[PDB]
Design a protein around this ligand. Structure first.
Ligand SMILES: O=C(O)CCC(=O)C(=O)O
Ligand SMILES: [Fe+3]
Ligand SMILES: [K+]
Ligand code: NA
Lengths: 429, 19
């Protein structure tokens, strides 16, 4: 269906097809030398150059080599420098470049490729949509929002643009504005709209505005396979792990860790209070838009299984104690952090990103009334020197209506059923 | 940005190529 042969390439079509047939059969090494001779004998053939780049792509896949793939990326670009390149071939080659550049983590490089595509094909709406994705991946929501606005100005009912526009609005706390975009986008059925991210935030946005129909979108996200359950809505999951809102120390197996926290809880408290009094700046405000109201800060010692050395200078005894427990210092999908919360604070119902961690809370300073945490349909209270354990991949919520501050210690551990091989291989979150 | 407590980012992992 795609036209990939310019006038000259049609005159060597049998040579080109013979080389491609070698590649489709999996004879990658013979297809590499086939297209190499084609590139040597016809250095201006776009189809021969695309064949070279495609063989390198399969060779990188076969060898799991980033460097080989990097050679493919450059060759994909060489196709676009050749003269008399068909438009279909020009798009395929450069789109695959951005795709492989993202797979390697070269977000700034994919960005340039995507910009060249929009310039070379200013009437392709999908290429503008892909440019917005490149921005969303690098962290540039401002340029991502302008892109989808330009898309919506021309094609206002493009569903892909609507869900991404809605996602950007929600992330910017424009809750009410984002609902009609996330809803119309998902309902459009356009390619790219059936994504758990859009179901997740559409139901959360509706929850924040008191829209009772929020769970209808959680239910449909479960039916479409994006959520393990209507309650447990994490999106970076290992399937099969025991789903349970609340956990007991013995259920987790980390009883040695729980005893150490509950035996030495006062030293952990004291170092926290000491930071509160003489190093307030180490406590950083929560910055994921999880608060309806109030004040909430976190002092993080371990993140992504990495220890912050300067943070541990503020709690050296606590960091010394925790280093004996790799099930938490090595949880690259969790943290170790003090969490302080003051009266007048309500944390929105939310869920964490992954089901691969369990979350421990050690009570350090707990006022006698006004503090409580709900996970799923069960609500509990903290206690000074005791450890609660819950799966934050379930929906959870917190209120702080005391008359003084409430300080706890948050300790994430790998899900107990995760094998050591999985704990080493899972990408960090 | 990183997804520490929620799912607010478009992507929560960092791409590092092949494994
Ligand atoms: O109560 C706190 O300090 C934080 C509550 C929460 O949402 C969590 O620990 O996941
Ligand atoms: Fe939480
Ligand atoms: K503070
Ligand atoms: Na030539």
């Amino acid at each position: 269906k795609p036209k990939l042969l310019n006038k000259f390439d049609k005159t060597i079509k049998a040579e080109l097809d013979a080389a491609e047939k070698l590649r489709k059969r999996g004879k990658i090494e013979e297809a590499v030398n086939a297209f190499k001779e084609l590139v040597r004998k016809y250095p201006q053939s776009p189809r021969a150059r695309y064949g070279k780049a495609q063989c390198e792509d399969d060779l990188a896949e076969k060898r799991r080599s980033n460097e080989v793939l990097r050679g493919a990326i450059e060759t994909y670009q060489e196709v676009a420098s050749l003269p008399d390149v068909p438009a279909d071939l020009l798009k395929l080659s450069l789109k695959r470049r951005s795709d492989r550049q993202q797979f390697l983590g070269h977000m700034r490089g994919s960005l340039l490729t995507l910009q060249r595509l929009v310039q070379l094909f200013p009437n392709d709406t999908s290429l503008k949509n892909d440019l917005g994705v490149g921005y969303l991946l690098i962290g540039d929501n401002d340029n991502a929002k302008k892109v989808y606005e330009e898309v919506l100005s021309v094609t206002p009912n493009d569903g892909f643009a609507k869900v991404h526009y809605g996602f950007i609005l929600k992330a910017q706390n424009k809750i009410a504005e984002s609902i009609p975009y996330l809803k119309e986008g998902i309902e459009s059925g356009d390619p790219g709209t059936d994504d758990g991210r859009f179901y997740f935030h559409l139901g959360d946005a509706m929850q924040r505005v008191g829209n009772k129909e929020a769970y209808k979108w959680y239910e449909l996200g479960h039916k479409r396979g994006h959520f393990a359950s209507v309650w447990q809505r994490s999106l970076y999951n290992v399937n099969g792990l025991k789903a349970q809102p609340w956990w007991t120390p013995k259920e987790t197996g980390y009883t040695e860790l729980v005893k150490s926290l509950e035996r030495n809880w006062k030293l952990i408290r004291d170092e926290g209070l000491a930071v509160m009094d003489k190093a307030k700046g180490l406590f950083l405000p929560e910055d994921e838009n999880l608060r309806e109201k109030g004040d909430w800060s976190q002092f993080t010692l371990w993140q992504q299984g990495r220890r912050n050395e300067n943070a541990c200078k503020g709690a050296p005894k606590t960091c010394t104690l925790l280093e004996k427990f790799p099930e938490t210092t090595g949880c690259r999908r969790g943290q170790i952090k003090y969490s302080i919360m003051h009266p007048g604070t309500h944390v929105w119902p939310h869920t964490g990103p992954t089901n691969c961690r369990l979350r421990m809370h050690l009570g350090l300073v707990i006022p006698k009334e006004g503090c409580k945490i709900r996970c799923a349909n069960e609500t509990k209270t903290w206690e000074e020197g005791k450890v609660l354990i819950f799966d934050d991949s379930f929906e959870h919520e917190v209120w702080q209506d005391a008359s003084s501050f409430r300080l706890i210690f948050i300790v994430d551990v790998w899900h107990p059923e995760l094998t050591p091989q999985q704990r080493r291989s899972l990408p960090a979150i | 940005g990183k997804c520490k407590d929620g799912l607010g980012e478009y992507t929560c992992t960092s791409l590092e190529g092949f494994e």
